Amino acid sequence: SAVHPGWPDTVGPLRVPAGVVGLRPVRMRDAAAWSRIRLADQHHLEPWEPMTGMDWKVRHAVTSWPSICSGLRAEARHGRMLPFVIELDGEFVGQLTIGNVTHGALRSAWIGYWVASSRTGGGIATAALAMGLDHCFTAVQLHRIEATVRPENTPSRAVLAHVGFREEGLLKRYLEVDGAWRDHLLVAITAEELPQSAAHRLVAAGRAEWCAA
Amino acid sequence: SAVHPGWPDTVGPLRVPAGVVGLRPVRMRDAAAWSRIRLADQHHLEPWEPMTGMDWKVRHAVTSWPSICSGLRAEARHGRMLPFVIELDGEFVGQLTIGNVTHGALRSAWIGYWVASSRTGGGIATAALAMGLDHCFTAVQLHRIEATVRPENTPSRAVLAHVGFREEGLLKRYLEVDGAWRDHLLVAITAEELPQSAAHRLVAAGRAEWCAA
Numbered sequence: 098s099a100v101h102p103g104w105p106d107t108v109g110p111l112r113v114p115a116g117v118v119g120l121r122p123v124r125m126r127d128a129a130a131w132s133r134i135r136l137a138d139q140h141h142l143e144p145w146e147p148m149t150g151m152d153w154k155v156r157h158a159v160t161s162w163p164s165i166c167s168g169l170r171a172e173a174r175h176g177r178m179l180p181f182v183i184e185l186d187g188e189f190v191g192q193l194t195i196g197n198v199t200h201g202a203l204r205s206a207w208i209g210y211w212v213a214s215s216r217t218g219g220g221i222a223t224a225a226l227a228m229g230l231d232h233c234f235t236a237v238q239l240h241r242i243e244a245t246v247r248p249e250n251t252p253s254r255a256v257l258a259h260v261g262f263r264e265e266g267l268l269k270r271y272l273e274v275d276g277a278w279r280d281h282l283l284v285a286i287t288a289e290e291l292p293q294s295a296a297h298r299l300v301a302a303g304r305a306e307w308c309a310a
Numbered sequence: 311s312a313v314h315p316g317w318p319d320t321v322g323p324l325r326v327p328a329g330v331v332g333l334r335p336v337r338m339r340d341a342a343a344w345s346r347i348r349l350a351d352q353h354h355l356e357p358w359e360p361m362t363g364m365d366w367k368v369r370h371a372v373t374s375w376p377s378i379c380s381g382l383r384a385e386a387r388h389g390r391m392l393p394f395v396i397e398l399d400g401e402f403v404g405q406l407t408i409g410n411v412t413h414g415a416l417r418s419a420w421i422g423y424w425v426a427s428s429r430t431g432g433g434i435a436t437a438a439l440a441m442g443l444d445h446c447f448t449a450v451q452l453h454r455i456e457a458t459v460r461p462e463n464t465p466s467r468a469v470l471a472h473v474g475f476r477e478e479g480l481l482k483r484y485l486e487v488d489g490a491w492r493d494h495l496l497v498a499i500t501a502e503e504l505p506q507s508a509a510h511r512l513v514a515a516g517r518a519e520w521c522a523a
């Protein structure tokens with residue numbers, strides 16, 4: 098609370114074109130869904146994520162999740178991360194992760210996401226980011242959220258741009274990804290920008306739609 | 311709403327022995343799970359179910375859900391029902407329905423529930439009822455909730471008694487169930503009783519457990 102404001106919590110639900118979307122904390126029983134999607138989407142994920150030095154299938158066995166989940170929840174207990182699951186109609190379809198959380202005179206964090214490729218409804222990732230931003234700039238009392246994305250990652254750049262992230266810079270040789278140190282764009286948005294952002298319009302419309310009897 | 315206070319809404323989540331439990335509105339995408347479970351559980355449910363005048367397999371076919379769901383949601387829009395789904399770890403595992411809602415000088419409604427047979431006897435129904443009661447006595451601004459249960463339905467009588475329902479009477483030949491008009495006990499609880507009730511203790515403990523980081 099003092100140590101970890103806004104954690105644990107849920108975010109949403111919203112009703113968006115894909116269905117009902119929400120964020121809620123990672124938990125041990127997510128092992129099966131997490132494993133299934135991460136294994137299936139290896140070609141979508143492995144070359145776009147930081148290198149782990151591990152075999153992908155070994156890493157994403159069902160039996161691997163407990164240690165990972167425990168680690169994420171430990172960081173969240175220290176107020177350094179907020180590890181959410183993206184739900185579509187109550188089902189695990191990905192993760193929305195707030196990381197490197199600081200307060201003091203910085204009050205900033207990064208945000209990362211991934212969504213199962215099998216869910217084709219569209220707007221799931223943007224809704225997740227928009228919910229994450231609203232939660233961070235209210236309950237978590239943050240001032241700024243940033244993200245890093247390779248210039249070559251056309252779909253992710255579009256998702257981030259859509260909800261209102263601004264390009265702030267180009268980080269040279271920033272992260273070890275797909276066998277090399279790769280440039281990443283740095284994008285960001287601050288709390289002053291949220292009310293006029295697409296992210297706010299998405300959440301407001303999503304809540305209005307959800308609340309329609 | 312003026313017309314439908316407390317609707318639509320979610321209730322919970324709680325963490326209880328069975329897992330994470332919550333209530334949320336019925337929706338069209340529930341057709342597959344509702345149909346699968348109600349068909350599989352025919353012989354657990356049908357001896358206790360008000361008669362519909364049609365074959366169980368016809369009534370609970372996946373293509374039957376849209377009209378049922380639309381009807382429930384229409385009644386809710388008029389403030390006469392609150393039709394919830396019981397979730398366990400985000401999955402449809404039954405229903406919690408508030409019906410015959412009145413306000414004025416009565417402020418009463420009935421509550422009914424069912425839980426998937428493979429999941430029963432684990433605290434899911436008691437949690438669902440406790441959440442229902444809390445929601446009814448706060449957001450829906452009700453004063454009284456009642457339920458009906460056949461004297462022969464020993465497990466349901468135990469579930470209802472556990473959370474604080476009082477026996478008030480025996481309704482002779484009350485509902486058409488399993489081929490005849492069957493006696494049902496009437497049980498009830500009023501808002502004055504909530505603070506000292508097992509229902510309140512369950513919800514408070516469930517909220518506290520959920521909030522543990």
Ligand SMILES: [Cl-]
Pocket residue numbers: 121122323330
């Ligand atoms: Cl949860």
Ligand SMILES: [Cl-]
Pocket residue numbers: 110117334335
């Ligand atoms: Cl919902």
Ligand SMILES: [Cl-]
Pocket residue numbers: 430431432433434435436437469
């Ligand atoms: Cl139970």
